[PDB]
Amino acid sequence: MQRIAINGFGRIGRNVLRAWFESPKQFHFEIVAINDIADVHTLVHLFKYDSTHGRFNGKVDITIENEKIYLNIQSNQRLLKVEVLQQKQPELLPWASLKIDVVLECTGLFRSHADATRHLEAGAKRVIIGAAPFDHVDAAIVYGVNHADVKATDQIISSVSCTTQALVPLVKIIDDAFGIETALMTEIHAVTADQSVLDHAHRDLRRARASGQNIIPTTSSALGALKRVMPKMEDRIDGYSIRVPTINVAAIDLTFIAQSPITVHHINELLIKASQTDYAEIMAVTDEPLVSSDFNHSPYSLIVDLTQTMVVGHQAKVFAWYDNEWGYANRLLDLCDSFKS
Amino acid sequence: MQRIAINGFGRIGRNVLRAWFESPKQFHFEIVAINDIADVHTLVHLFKYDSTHGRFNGKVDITIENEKIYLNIQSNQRLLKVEVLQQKQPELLPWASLKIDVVLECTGLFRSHADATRHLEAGAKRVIIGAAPFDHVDAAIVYGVNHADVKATDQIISSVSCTTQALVPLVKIIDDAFGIETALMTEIHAVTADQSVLDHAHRDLRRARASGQNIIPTTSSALGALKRVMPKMEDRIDGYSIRVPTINVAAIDLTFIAQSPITVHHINELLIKASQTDYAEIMAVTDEPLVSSDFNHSPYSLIVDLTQTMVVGHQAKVFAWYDNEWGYANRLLDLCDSFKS
Amino acid sequence: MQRIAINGFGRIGRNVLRAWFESPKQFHFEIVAINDIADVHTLVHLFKYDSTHGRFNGKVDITIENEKIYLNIQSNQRLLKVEVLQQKQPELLPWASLKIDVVLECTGLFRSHADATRHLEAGAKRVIIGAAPFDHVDAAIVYGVNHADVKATDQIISSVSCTTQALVPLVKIIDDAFGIETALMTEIHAVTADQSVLDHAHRDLRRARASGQNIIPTTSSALGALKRVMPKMEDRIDGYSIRVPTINVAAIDLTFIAQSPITVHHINELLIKASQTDYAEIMAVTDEPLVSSDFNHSPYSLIVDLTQTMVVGHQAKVFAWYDNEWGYANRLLDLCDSFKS
Amino acid sequence: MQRIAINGFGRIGRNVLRAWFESPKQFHFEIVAINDIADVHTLVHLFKYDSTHGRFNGKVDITIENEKIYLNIQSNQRLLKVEVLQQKQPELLPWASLKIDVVLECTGLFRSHADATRHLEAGAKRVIIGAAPFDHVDAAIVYGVNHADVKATDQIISSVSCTTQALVPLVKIIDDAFGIETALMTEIHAVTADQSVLDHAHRDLRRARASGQNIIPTTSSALGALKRVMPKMEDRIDGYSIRVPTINVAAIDLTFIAQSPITVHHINELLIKASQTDYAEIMAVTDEPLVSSDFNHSPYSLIVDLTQTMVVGHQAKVFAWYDNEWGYANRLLDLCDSFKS
Ligand SMILES: NC(=O)c1ccc[n+]([C@@H]2O[C@H](COP(=O)([O-])OP(=O)(O)OC[C@H]3O[C@@H](n4cnc5c(N)ncnc54)[C@H](O)[C@@H]3O)[C@@H](O)[C@H]2O)c1
Ligand SMILES: NC(=O)c1ccc[n+]([C@@H]2O[C@H](COP(=O)([O-])OP(=O)(O)OC[C@H]3O[C@@H](n4cnc5c(N)ncnc54)[C@H](O)[C@@H]3O)[C@@H](O)[C@H]2O)c1
Ligand SMILES: NC(=O)c1ccc[n+]([C@@H]2O[C@H](COP(=O)([O-])OP(=O)(O)OC[C@H]3O[C@@H](n4cnc5c(N)ncnc54)[C@H](O)[C@@H]3O)[C@@H](O)[C@H]2O)c1
Ligand SMILES: NC(=O)c1ccc[n+]([C@@H]2O[C@H](COP(=O)([O-])OP(=O)(O)OC[C@H]3O[C@@H](n4cnc5c(N)ncnc54)[C@H](O)[C@@H]3O)[C@@H](O)[C@H]2O)c1
Structure with a gap:
């Protein structure tokens, strides 16, 4: 089970989770965690109500199992239990514990190989920087052009910009x-x-x-x-x-x-x-x-x-x-x- | 004669300084200091070019003395020399050196009696909070209604909201x-x-x-x-x-x-x-x-x-x-x- | 069934036709004619592409049949064949031949009792003015409040305003x-x-x-x-x-x-x-x-x-x-x- | 004095008359008439209040002298008395009697050599089409590029677009x-x-x-x-x-x-x-x-x-x-x- 997490529940981050649910073809991986510097209630509100893309066609309910916060999201015959975090410093995030395979870095503040590696230190196996490269990346990827040039050894990746x-x-x-x-x-x-x-x-x-x-x-x-x-x-x-x-x-x-x-x-x-x-x-x-x-x-x-x-x-x-x-x-x-x- | 400072060079702070020059009648006080967390270059640019009220009709020169930065502003036959500071903590402001009679608090972040007094500690004789009071003020004034009810003893004043x-x-x-x-x-x-x-x-x-x-x-x-x-x-x-x-x-x-x-x-x-x-x-x-x-x-x-x-x-x-x-x-x-x- | 016509294919006219297709429950009446002072191509484009409510989720094809222009619209498992007219003068419309039971008057221009009657004196059995009354009307109806008070003698009806x-x-x-x-x-x-x-x-x-x-x-x-x-x-x-x-x-x-x-x-x-x-x-x-x-x-x-x-x-x-x-x-x-x- | 007239008191016509008053050097002709299909009260209102350019810094006074509506304008130490007309058809304009030397044709409606000549057969000596030419012209000018290339025999000139x-x-x-x-x-x-x-x-x-x-x-x-x-x-x-x-x-x-x-x-x-x-x-x-x-x-x-x-x-x-x-x-x-x- 490929396990994705989103660092930064913003314009992109939110529209990644929505697009996971709205896609005609179900994706063979799961988003299991989101981290933002904002409270779960602000994030849930913004996820449900979007000025640009309209109400979310689905239901989201918050549960506090353990001392952990989960989002229960039901839409388009699909369900996901998503852990919410609130950790400004990405090396302190529990990516080891959650078995995270890929991190979508969508904050805009961690675009250097150094800053991105902090996710690897925290336990993630791979990082996609959802922005242009600042200094160095293992690969720079435009899907539909050169995405087959990704090597298994590659850990820091940029999906460049739109x-x-x-x-x-x-x-x-x-x-x-x-x-x-x-x-x-x-x-x-x-x-x-x-x-x-x-x-x-x-x-x-x-x-x-x-x-x-x-x-x-x-x-x-x-x-x-x-x-x-x-x-x-x-x-x-x-x-x-x-x-x-x-x-x-x-x-x-x-x-x-x-x-x-x-x-x-x-x-x-x-x-x-x-x-x-x-x-x-x-x-x-x-x-x-x-x-x-x-x-x-x-x-x-x-x-x-x-x-x-x-x-x-x-x-x-x-x-x-x-x-x-x-x-x-x-x-x-x-x-x-x-x-x- | 009376020396005013402005803490927060935004939409209010900037239009205060502009209104002083544009006034059809010359005010009897002078504005002699401004503080903001941003640099003097950003402050001069925004003071000169404004989306709402147009180009400032006047000259703005920056003087970097050894330690101090000043603005020399010339408009409508009036001139001001205006020390420029960059201090996030209002208690560290040189209000004593600059002999500040009134401070206009136009940041939005210092509306409590406690936070306003920080200007008093820095050496200012009177604060006017440019916002509704948050807890205690010695007076809450609407110019043209109860501005006479200001007592000479009154040190923290609120000018309420627009x-x-x-x-x-x-x-x-x-x-x-x-x-x-x-x-x-x-x-x-x-x-x-x-x-x-x-x-x-x-x-x-x-x-x-x-x-x-x-x-x-x-x-x-x-x-x-x-x-x-x-x-x-x-x-x-x-x-x-x-x-x-x-x-x-x-x-x-x-x-x-x-x-x-x-x-x-x-x-x-x-x-x-x-x-x-x-x-x-x-x-x-x-x-x-x-x-x-x-x-x-x-x-x-x-x-x-x-x-x-x-x-x-x-x-x-x-x-x-x-x-x-x-x-x-x-x-x-x-x-x-x-x-x- | 009942046959409805739309005079004025604008913000209201177009969205009426759209909402017929988008309704969860199929209406028991058909929209069989539209009239605007604009060319069918302008009307089809505007129908298909809307700045406010998005693309029309369905297909629109134009047909010419005996000098008559028809729009074939398919959406939400429904089809309408909709004759298209371009007559600025309501008295000269073919409501009698089209056997129109109700005209939706959405132009802005024919709100008076006398102007709305031009649709009656062209063959229609009833006219709903899609605006407040200008002078008088047989009835002024808000659905959900008083739609049950409509009588058979009410031939000119105002659906008032939003x-x-x-x-x-x-x-x-x-x-x-x-x-x-x-x-x-x-x-x-x-x-x-x-x-x-x-x-x-x-x-x-x-x-x-x-x-x-x-x-x-x-x-x-x-x-x-x-x-x-x-x-x-x-x-x-x-x-x-x-x-x-x-x-x-x-x-x-x-x-x-x-x-x-x-x-x-x-x-x-x-x-x-x-x-x-x-x-x-x-x-x-x-x-x-x-x-x-x-x-x-x-x-x-x-x-x-x-x-x-x-x-x-x-x-x-x-x-x-x-x-x-x-x-x-x-x-x-x-x-x-x-x-x- | 040379005598100019404006057909079309819109964004251009209105700003022409403003530009006359606001200009730092005084212009050596006068504007002596304007025409528009809207009434004088509207024209004055839109001339005095502008969403783009702000309030007109002057005074406008409507006077009725012998079934002739005149505007008495003062701004920037200058004066004008301007006859106002409401004539849809240019050939019926009184350019001969008013001794018009140039018409600024700012309606967007009369761009043909034929439609511009209607102002010639109505008494004016020269016309400037305030837009790109539709058919043909005696000259197409960009002030500060080829304005010296105007011949005195030229009667239909275009000042092209912005x-x-x-x-x-x-x-x-x-x-x-x-x-x-x-x-x-x-x-x-x-x-x-x-x-x-x-x-x-x-x-x-x-x-x-x-x-x-x-x-x-x-x-x-x-x-x-x-x-x-x-x-x-x-x-x-x-x-x-x-x-x-x-x-x-x-x-x-x-x-x-x-x-x-x-x-x-x-x-x-x-x-x-x-x-x-x-x-x-x-x-x-x-x-x-x-x-x-x-x-x-x-x-x-x-x-x-x-x-x-x-x-x-x-x-x-x-x-x-x-x-x-x-x-x-x-x-x-x-x-x-x-x-x-
Ligand atoms: N919006 C676009 O059209 C677009 C397109 C392509 C790429 N991008 C890139 O995506 C990135 C993000 O853009 P956006 O539009 O989503 O911005 P945004 O401001 O909408 O989202 C940023 C999010 O990061 C959160 N955040 C801030 N500090 C954080 C921290 N320390 N840890 C975790 N989360 C934190 C913010 O609270 C916010 O939710 C930028 O690099 C931008 O260039 C944007
Ligand atoms: N704009 C209005 O219509 C209006 C009317 C009445 C009252 N107010 C109030 O006036 C205040 C100013 O808001 P504004 O409209 O000017 O917004 P603004 O954001 O433009 O003003 C804030 C300014 O303060 C600066 N600043 C931030 N932290 C600072 C610090 N620690 N020290 C110094 N400067 C700092 C910012 O860089 C900025 O220039 C607010 O309390 C606002 O509610 C505004
Ligand atoms: N839009 C709203 O929020 C709203 C709400 C309630 C009621 N209304 C009313 O609905 C009416 C229509 O408004 P709208 O928003 O659709 O405006 P609109 O301008 O979008 O619609 C008018 C349409 O009528 C056409 N038209 C003009 N003259 C015509 C004629 N002689 N014959 C046939 N068609 C002609 C125009 O080409 C256009 O397609 C108005 O009375 C308005 O008050 C509008
Ligand atoms: N606005 C620009 O940026 C710009 C720049 C260069 C050229 N132009 C051109 O100048 C022309 C005028 O455009 P505008 O921006 O002033 O638009 P506008 O619609 O604001 O002006 C047209 C004016 O003419 C009046 N009018 C209409 N029919 C008339 C008639 N028969 N007789 C007299 N007056 C009549 C209208 O009531 C209105 O006052 C257009 O050809 C436009 O493309 C505009």
Whole structure:
């Protein structure tokens, strides 16, 4: 029985547990523990009531067996007994006792090999850092691209970021068919939980500004991460991100120079075929004039807007949507499932 | 001559300093110190650029002397030199060296008599807590109502809340004229800084919810504060507050039972006359069809919308706007200037 | 069976059709025609993709048959074949040939007795105006309160408004138990389809102003409508509405003077009982600390927040949420289902 | 004095008349009439109260002199007396009698050479179409690029769109220095008046969706318009616009392939020099970490953000903000001021 734990019951952490229950196909592993710096009642409330994704279709009841707190969660013909912890320092967590095989590190505060190892010290056998690498990782993984490159010896793993999980497939596909000389990316991202409601002191002066009333351009970890996953693309791609006042969903605007003839038709035909043959698990395409909120609660790593494709000579722009929250949470579960044989 | 400090350079603290320069009349005191846990660069940036009230019209120079940091601010033909500090523990602040007559406590974290006295220990002669009292205050003041009841011996003072500054004049005016059996308050409030961008752990489960996408009912400190200012109204006034996704500006909806004949005409007439005589300093009245944005950057403590006044039988409702940041800020200055004679 | 038509395929019209498919229990009537001044392609897209309630879970195909446009919709193990019209003038619609028994009038534009009769003088046996009455009507019905009073002579019926469906029960339940001398209503409502995106010319100078950036007080049709269902409440209740920048869901504050002794406990116990017995189909009660987005897609006509119930003296206030789109659409279908004999 | 008139008192028309008063240098023509299909009381109300730009810092007085409605405006030590009209059809306007020299045609309705000439056959000597040309024009101008290229025989002029006036200088400057082979544009743009509060039928299926809750990709007239100004760029530039839920201010992201060596330093130094010489009136450069709301009420056509300049190989991105209302209203005044002798 593969045993997963979630460190950090936040936007991702919560949507991992939900996605475990909502998946059409039951996963061959169990979440047995969650740890957050917050009280079980706050976590249960936030788990049940979600501004972005709606009420949880199920029932959650708290029990105090031993001096241990459990969540009894019943949804979609599925049940789970989940231990709740409240330990800010991850080396003190009982991962030995609970027989934890994988830890989903979803706090954002423990992204260095050092900080992550603290879970291994605490008894976990493997750690997935649900964010970009800070210093070193054993592997950097985009599910549906290179998840078969995980070695059994590998203990610290990054599932990079959602922006990375969308950008890489696009770049792999386009570069393989046509050759990317160079490329530049603009991400139009919804508000994130680290921003400010009103103008407020913050380590980053741009993200200190009122989230609901501003367009805020800012840096992206997706490019550092993409270079780890695809080394040959070093010095051939940069980009940045823009926060705008919506609650969820993002897009990528990839502009690239092609190394061979391109048309709008051949680009869209290539992506449709890729989505049908090699990337069907994680990639879709739409021909409809849709907007961000139409992709809310979509499980795909990317959905391409074929009506947005543009070519002027050698230069081209493609455009893809993704649910930064749900897309990534599904990929976390997809990845965990991949370790079993 | 009189030397003021500001502890907490946020939406209140920053708009206090701005209001001092912008005031059409020069105040007789000077602001000579500011403290926040953030660095001077972050403080200057946020002081200059504001999502709500625009670019600061003036020059801000930072002087790093050997040990001390100062701001040299020049605006509207006035100049201030302002020592800048970064001390989380208010008792370690150099209020003695700097000869601080009044400290404005604008952090939200030092509302007890104990915590306010920490400024007194640091050397300050008087504290004004910029919030409702938590336990004991030597006086609880609404400028324009009972600001004369400040005794020269009084060392810890509360300037109550924005909401209170507006609610009290309404209750006083109406109670004096018609008599209030009881009243109930609904406040519609722009978002505040303590809220959450996305759904996130927080000690209020209602304010944990995404600020930009929800109507959020919640408690008001204004009711306990009113009972300190007007003790006769204990057991006769209750109310609550609603957060909605605007950036600034609030409204108060007050529903009361009159103890003598009321009409719409009579209520409006009384409110107009008070804004023209006894409350001309802090109170205004419009009959124009306005909306929240129109009161952005108004200094008045309340602006009555007379078109909204209603009466059925012995029950009536009135309505008033206020700029929750600017009005409050102005009334802190107005209070500090009342201490002198 | 009974044949229903929808005139005006907007927020209400579209959600009526959606709620027919989504209903747990199949309605014993069919929707056989829709009419809008817009092209079928615009209408199908908007039907399929909704910013507020998500993707339509089902398939929509367009057919041309003898110059007639039909929509074949399949969902929830149900199918409808729905003829599509584009006639701005109700008198020229084919209600006689389509054998329409009931027209849902959802345009906003035909609320007068005389305008609504244009559907009758085009072949329809009965018209439900999906709004408060303009002048007069044969009946004004709130489902769950007085749907049984519909007579066969009632050919023009008003289903009033969202706000009225929520208010009338509240006022009825509480008047019957404790007695209401008088009452005043404050509605907090999400933005509506008739507002302006930016400050623009408009009939109402308040709804002229930017929908996404303002608190906007405004009139409410609810009180006129309530007085037409409960004529004894003439002179005993008034109120108004406040638009705030959320996409959907509304709340009502009712402040009343009781005529007998009251406490918070007795009020909540009465409202829980009513939600369990007489009003169970249309009314719920929550004790949890929830926010607006938690009631998106709720079918209830009101959900009381009992944590919000206040009492001071003989004066009380109760608070209730409703999904202003989904509730109202479900009450329309529920009303039509009440006609079968 | 030269005599200007405004058809369409909207976001542009209103800001034109404001910009007249607020401008630091006095303009050497007068605005002597405005027309709109809304009544004068509405026009004055929207002119005095703005959700974006705040209260008009002046006085407006309506006078009736002989069945002629006039506005008497005072602000910034200046005066105007402006006749107000309410004429739906331009050929019926009294331009001959009022001796109109230029009409600022700011309705969005009369962009054809045919529809603009209706104002010529009604008495005016010259017309400026305040938008991209629909069919053809005597000249398409970007003030500060080709405004010297107006011939006195030109009667139908276009001042293109906001976006065109940020894009064209960028393209000109860069192409001239480094050579542009091809380029693609992304515009991030605040909501405009033509959008939808909620999902509503609309000519454009993207702009039909809720303006306040969506990222909305859409077309841009700027690429048509730029090719009328610079025909050599046919087939070499393309792009699109994204609407996000802010109220004002846009940004342009321009990706180009340079025909010669480029660095970030060299690009930034070119744009700085230009902003200090030939483009000083319309262009500025910042390297501060600012956000959209800091450029509200900036008179410039574009403010380049240095920190955003990226180069990879031969491909490069640049980014520039503009106030899509104020920048444009000021360039319309600047256009009229250039005509004189
Ligand atoms: N939200 C997205 O769209 C998205 C997508 C991909 C990756 N990520 C990454 O996921 C990480 C978390 O993001 P999020 O949106 O969930 O943030 P969040 O703030 O919603 O969640 C963080 C959680 O960590 C908890 N926490 C804080 N300190 C802790 C500690 N010492 N031990 C345990 N729990 C602790 C917080 O209480 C909170 O519940 C970040 O690195 C972010 O970059 C986010
Ligand atoms: N904003 C309003 O409308 C309003 C109106 C009336 C009263 N108040 C009250 O005023 C107070 C200030 O809140 P705000 O709106 O300015 O929010 P805010 O978060 O902007 O203000 C808090 C500020 O205090 C600083 N701070 C935190 N810990 C500190 C410490 N130990 N020492 C010094 N500075 C510290 C923060 O960095 C920040 O700048 C609160 O009590 C609030 O409830 C606010
Ligand atoms: N949305 C709510 O919360 C709510 C609740 C209760 C009642 N209502 C009422 O329902 C009515 C409709 O409001 P809505 O929110 O659906 O607005 P809406 O603008 O979304 O719906 C109006 C629809 O009518 C169409 N239309 C306009 N003129 C027409 C004509 N001559 N013939 C046919 N179709 C025409 C429009 O194209 C559009 O599809 C209004 O009276 C409103 O007060 C709305
Ligand atoms: N807002 C921007 O960012 C921006 C920038 C550049 C160009 N423009 C263009 O300027 C034009 C005006 O747009 P806006 O933003 O001012 O929109 P708007 O809808 O606010 O302005 C249109 C105005 O014209 C009035 N009107 C309508 N029909 C009329 C008629 N027949 N005669 C007279 N007046 C009539 C309307 O009542 C309204 O006052 C559009 O073509 C727009 O694309 C807008």
